[PDB]
Amino acid sequence: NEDVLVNVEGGVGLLTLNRPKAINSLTHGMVTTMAERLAAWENDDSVRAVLLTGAGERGLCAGGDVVAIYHSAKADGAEARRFWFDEYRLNAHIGRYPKPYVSIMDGIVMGGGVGVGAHGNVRVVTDTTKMAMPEVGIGFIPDVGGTYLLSRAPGKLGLHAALTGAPFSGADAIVMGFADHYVPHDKIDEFTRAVIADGVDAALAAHAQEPPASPLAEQRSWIDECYTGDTVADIIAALRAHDAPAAGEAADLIATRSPIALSVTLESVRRAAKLQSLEDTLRQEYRVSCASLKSHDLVEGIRAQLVNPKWRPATLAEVTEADVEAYFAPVDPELTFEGE
Ligand SMILES: [Cl-]
Ligand SMILES: [Zn+2]
Ligand SMILES: [Zn+2]
Ligand SMILES: [Zn+2]
Ligand SMILES: [Zn+2]
Ligand SMILES: [Zn+2]
């Protein structure tokens, strides 16, 4: 099997993620294929644009392959670090890319799938889009430039998405700055065909629609009320005190997540909000990911997903400021972006 299908048609470089039985989860091989093709096509005049899609019907991409990260974290972390090094460089390159990069973020789009789709410049979601950064549920922290996107969402919507790790819709994704355009699922095929035949602007004019109401946008009042707290424990207390079902549901979900991952996530998004550069943000995320490889909760979190995680530390009250600060320590080598 070719885990990424590659072709050029109508002047469009086509990248189709192709592990549909795994909802197209990303391997290191898939990342390097994408990266090499983006590099090869960048100065090739026969390629006017790039289009990223996923095979099958359930989603563009459910994430990075978590089994491989798990096996690496139990070993010496070498593959995980190399994977993230190459992946984050790819994320940055999509972010800078000079040619139109159209991503079809249909169906399930989570974690690493956000990384390959949501830094594009023509970002399409649909009525089946279920997008999330669910990292705290496995003892991890949103990466792949997710902290850059989360910190740029309106209000505190980004913190809500990051701490709950809950999915949000296509319309929500547009509100949060993770996507640009809305096309119903049973027009993606016509839309994709039109990009290839008539170009991006014609395809959009012909198939894009006004998104429906964003439920996340309607929740902004209590999100902004409750997520201004200094600590995750402050946030949970406020959500409970607001005494309404949607806030309570958020609190309940947060309370299932890794305490250390939640704490590092809150700090990451707050620090990312002060960084202008996608590259600088990814450098921070790389330190955090590297640190997470040495953690109890990353292994426990992924284990539980594969096989009720028992987090350690078990409570937010046991998380110290030094525990959080440890995730932001320098590493050697730092993530670098040269070789363009
Ligand atoms: Cl570039
Ligand atoms: Zn379909
Ligand atoms: Zn393995
Ligand atoms: Zn590798
Ligand atoms: Zn470039
Ligand atoms: Zn169709």
Automatic annotation (TrEMBL):
The residues listed in the UniProt record as binding Zn(2+) 3, with positions renumbered to this chain, are E57, H185
A GO biological process held by the record: L-valine catabolic process
Q: What class of enzyme is it?
A: hydrolase
Specify the superkingdom.
Bacteria
What reaction(s) does this enzyme catalyze?
3-hydroxy-2-methylpropanoyl-CoA + H2O = 3-hydroxy-2-methylpropanoate + CoA + H(+)
SUPFAM superfamilies in the record:
ClpP/crotonase
Alphabetically, the GO molecular function entries are: 3-hydroxyisobutyryl-CoA hydrolase activity; metal ion binding
Q: Which GO terms describe its cellular component?
A: cytosol
What are its E.C. numbers?
A: 3.1.2.4
Q: Which residues bind Zn(2+) 4?
A: H71
Ranges for the Enoyl-CoA hydratase/isomerase domain? 12-328
Which keywords, in A-to-Z order, does the entry hold?
Answer: Hydrolase, Metal-binding, Zinc
One Pfam match, given by its short name, reads ECH_2
| Residues the entry annotates as binding Zn(2+) 5 | D189
Spell out the InterPro entries in the cross-references. ClpP/crotonase-like_dom_sf, ECH_dom, HIBYL-CoA-H
Q: Which residues are listed for Zn(2+) 2 binding in this entry?
A: E42, H93, E340
Chain positions recorded as Zn(2+) 1 binding sites:
H28, E79
Protein name, per record: 3-hydroxyisobutyryl-CoA hydrolase
Taxonomic lineage of this organism?
A: Bacteria, Bacillati, Actinomycetota, Actinomycetes, Mycobacteriales
